Every structure is written in C-alpha cells, then in structure tokens.
Amino acid sequence: TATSDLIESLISYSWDDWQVTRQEARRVIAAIRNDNVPDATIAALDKSGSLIKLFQRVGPPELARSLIASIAGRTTMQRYQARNALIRSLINNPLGTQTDNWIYFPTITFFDICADLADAAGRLGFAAAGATGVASQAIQGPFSGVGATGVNPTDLPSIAFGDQLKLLNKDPATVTKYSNPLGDLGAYLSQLSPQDKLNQAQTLVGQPISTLFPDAYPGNPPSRAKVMSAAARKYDLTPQLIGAIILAEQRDQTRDEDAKDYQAAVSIKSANTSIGLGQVVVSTAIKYELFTDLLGQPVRRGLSRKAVATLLASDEFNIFATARYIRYVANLASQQDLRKLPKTRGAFPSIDLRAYAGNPRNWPRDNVRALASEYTSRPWDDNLSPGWPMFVDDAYATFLDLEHH
Ligand SMILES: [Ca+2]
Ligand SMILES: [Ca+2]
Ligand SMILES: [Ca+2]
Ligand SMILES: [Ca+2]
C-alpha cells in the first residue's frame, strides 16, 4: 500500500541513516493512523519482513506505545500477524512499553489492552472523536480533580517529601490537604448558581476523556459524554444518572486528592484508595471485575492490583467501572425485600425496588437518592449515607436540566 511503501522507506538504513529517529518514528505513527487500508498495510509489511523490524526499530517507549496502540487499534484481520511480529520483536529484551505510567503493563499486555479497548469502543459506540471542549484551569479547591481539569492523576508530580512525611505521621492539617474538600455539601450547592451548575456539568462531560491509551482510538479521544452514553446503553442506565454520580464525586475532589489517590495506591503500601472520575475503590474494581466489558478474561486474569489502580485513572475504564457498579447496585436492590429495609423505606418512601431492574428514566427520584447512598456506602445494609443522596440528587437535577438544554 502507499502507507507500507512510506513506512518501509522511513525505517530503512543507508550510507547515511543508521537509525530510526524520533521524527521518522512520529511519521510512521502518523502514517499508520492516517491509513485507509490498515490491514492491507500490515499484511504488506509482514510479507516483506518489515513488520518485526518496525517494532524493533521504533525505540523510545513513548513512541513504541503510540505505534503499538495505533496498530492494535486499526487492525482486524491482521491483528494476529501484528501481535506475533511484536512478540518476535521483543527477543532482545527491550523495555518495550513498560515504563513510566505504564510500568504495570507488560508490553504484550499493553497490545492486548489496546486491542480489546479499540474493539469495545467500536462495538459499544465510543470510538468517535470528541471536540476539544474546554477543561477547568483550577489547581485547588472543590471541582479541581481530573473531572474538571482533564489532568490525569498518573501525570501529577510526586507529592512533596515534606508532605509524605506529614501524611505518614497522620498530621491533621496535611491529611485535610489531601482529602475531600467539602464539609457541608448543601452549603456548597447553595453557593452555586444554576448557571454555575450547568457549567460544571458541561465542563465534565464535554471534554475529551483523559486516557492512558489515546492511540487505541482511530482519531482524537472521545468526549466523556460519548463514553457515558455507551456505558448507559450497555448497563441499562442513562448518561444523566452516571453523570450525576460522577459530578458529585468530582465536586468533592481536588488535584491534591487525585495525587494522593493514585500515588498511595501504587506505593509500596498498595493503599486501597478511591480513584478517578467515579471514585471507584481499587478493591471494588477487583471484587466485582469492573472492567469485564472492556477487557477479555485473559487480560483481566493477569492484571496486578497496581495495574487495576492505573486503569481506574483512565477515564473510559473508570466510566465503565462506575456504570457497571451502579448497575450491580441497582440489580442487587431489585432482589431485596423492602420489609427488611425499614430505614431505607423511611428515608426514601417512594423507593420502587422492582423499577431498579429497568432504566433510570422510569425510576422514582427516591431510587436515585437511595442508590446514591448505596453507591458510596455498603449496598442495601439499611445503613444510609447522611448527605450524599441529596448531593447526588441535585447533580441529577442539573443533568436533567442540561439534558433539557
Ligand atoms: Ca473526593
Ligand atoms: Ca482480548
Ligand atoms: Ca448502605
Ligand atoms: Ca447532555
């Protein structure tokens, strides 16, 4: 193909030219991504013995990641040929892609994640690129975590050593610095205009996902909204309900909290923190296999705890995890006997347990309120979160209003 022709030239050596430079590698990657016949291109490269050379010669891990994610993402019928060539290419024991943010994924696992993600994105309808909807520039206070800013938790600088020492000694002032920013939830909402609220919601859903696998997508990363819609369809939810849960968490989130969430989880301590958009707890993601619909069993079986924590920092994995767990909680609700949940019935008298089995568009508002309690706290133990239900319900009202807009 025209693309394989160019790639063969770019990776070749000459009288001069004893290396595939970073710029040549970038051109190769762009050619792969711009290609209208990617399977044909891979077939041609393999036939000429150039496929293994391609993987071996694109050296810096950051470029290897882009190359491998792009090829895994674009291939269908030649998927196996690419994977096999990648495997053969690693015989001289390169770092491959296993560095930096991706140090918890072996190189072949990186390929397999990208293949599964691209396939999921295609099948579930979130492959298509979103606009560069604007992120918040905030660096502290409520609504300054990744939901607002698009700054990935895995990209945040190491917490200052002085603070790590204070956090270790459980210093009140420093703990607060890295914890939930909101005390009185209702007081927080009371200080926002309707327009402020719609703005937050739009900021959250309108911007591209902060993803650890951007080149697995055919173009630019999809909007949060698109991924939330895909998850809503997969789990019989709505983007308004998923968005309400996430907007509540993100209002009660800061940049510093994000840094602590991630860094503690992958430290030698392997802390069980809540991570990312939906503040999914690492243990919950493992207990309930929350990536089931984006990653195959072979990939999931091999994931380390720290790999799981890292995936939770990738917005699309987090949105699917959040949504799958919401549907788990709703399904569990539908199996309950309301007579055995007198505190729940007391607090939410219009709760309809059977309705939980269906779509949120047909849920009473009390179902949204009760589920908010039972998302943040243990589900259906008849112990309720004090203020989370009205906090999420207000965000829900906003999404119904935004949906209105
Ligand atoms: Ca938080
Ligand atoms: Ca797979
Ligand atoms: Ca509970
Ligand atoms: Ca909307």
Closest ligand to Cα 377: 3
Task: In whole angstroms, give the CA distance from residue 298 to residue 238.
Answer: 30
CB 157 within 8 A of CB 164: no
Q: Say which ligand is closest to the CA of 133.
A: 4
Which helix or strand (DSSP H or E) is residue 114 part of?
helix 107-124
- Closest ligand relative to 206 C-alpha: 4
Alpha carbons within 13 A on the beta-carbon side of 270: 7
**381 among annotated binding-site residues:** yes
**What proportions of the chain, in percent to the nearest 5, are helix, strand and coil?**
65, 0, 35
Confirm or deny that 62 is annotated as ligand binding: no
Q: Quote the ligand 3 centre to 379 CA distance (angstroms).
A: 5
**Ligand positioned closest to the Cα atom of 389:** 3
Angstrom resolution of this structure: 1.5
The ligand with the least distance to the CA atom of 294 is 2
Burial of 100 (0-12, 13-18, 19+ CB in 10 A): exposed
Ligand nearest to the backbone CA of 374: 3
The angle subtended at Cα 389 by Cα 385 and Cα 378, nearest 5°, is 40
| Distance (Å) from CA 300 to ligand 2 centroid | 9
120 C-alpha to ligand 2 centroid (Å) = 10
Q: Cα(398) to centroid of ligand 1, in Å? A: 20
Q: For residues 316-335, b (16+ Cβ closer than 10 Å) or e, as one string?
A: bbbbbbbbbbbbbbbeebee
CA 189 / ligand 4 centre spacing (Å): 20
Q: What separation in Å is there between the alpha carbon of 376 and the centre of ligand 3?
A: 8
Helix (H) or strand (E) holding 280: strand 280-281
The ligand whose atoms approach the alpha carbon of 274 most closely is: 1
**Residue environment code for 272-289, b if the CB has 16+ CB neighbours within 10 A, otherwise e:** ebbbbbbbbbbebbbeee
338 close to 353: Cβ distance less than 8 angstroms: yes
Closest CA to 226 of 213, 245, 212, 243: 243
16 is in an annotated binding site: no
Confirm or deny that 253 is annotated as ligand binding: yes
List, in order, residues 6 or more apart from 71 with CB less than 8 Å away: 32, 38, 42, 82
Q: Which of 399, 404, 394 is nearest to 191 (CA)?
A: 394
Beta-strand relationship, 280-281 and 274-275: antiparallel
Q: What is the DSSP string of 344-371?
A: HHHH-TT--TGGGGS-GGGS-HHHHHHH
Residue 378 annotated as lining a ligand binding site:
yes
Report whether 257 belongs to an annotated binding site.
Answer: yes
**283 CA from centroid of ligand 2 (Å):** 23
Ligand nearest to the CA of 247: 1
Residues, beta carbon < 5 Å, ion ligand 4: 403
Angstrom distance (rounded) from CA 126 to CA 149? 21
Query: Ligand 3 centre and the CA of 283: distance in Å?
Result: 17
Asked if residue 34 belongs to a known ligand binding site, the reply is no
| Structural tokens at position 163 | 């603070």
Please name every residue paired with 275 in a beta bridge, in sequence order, or none if there are none.
280
Question: Annotated binding residue at 84?
Answer: no
Q: Does residue 141 contact residue 217 with C-beta atoms inside 8 Å? A: no
Q: Give bridge partners of residue 280 from the DSSP assignment.
A: 275
Q: Output the CA 232–ligand 2 centroid distance in Å.
A: 22
- Distance CA(44)–CA(34), nearest Å, equals 16
For residue 145, which ligand has an atom nearest its CA?
1
Helix (H) or strand (E) holding 203: helix 194-206
Distance, CA of 329 to CA of 392 (rounded, Å):
15
Q: Which of 252, 189, 236 is nearest to 390 (CA)?
A: 189
29 CA from centroid of ligand 2 (Å) = 23
Q: What is d(CA 216, CA 212) in angstroms, rounded to the nearest whole number?
A: 9
Report how far ligand 2's centroid is from the alpha carbon of 109 (Å): 9
Instruction: Give the Å distance between the CA of 403 and the centre of ligand 4.
Output: 4
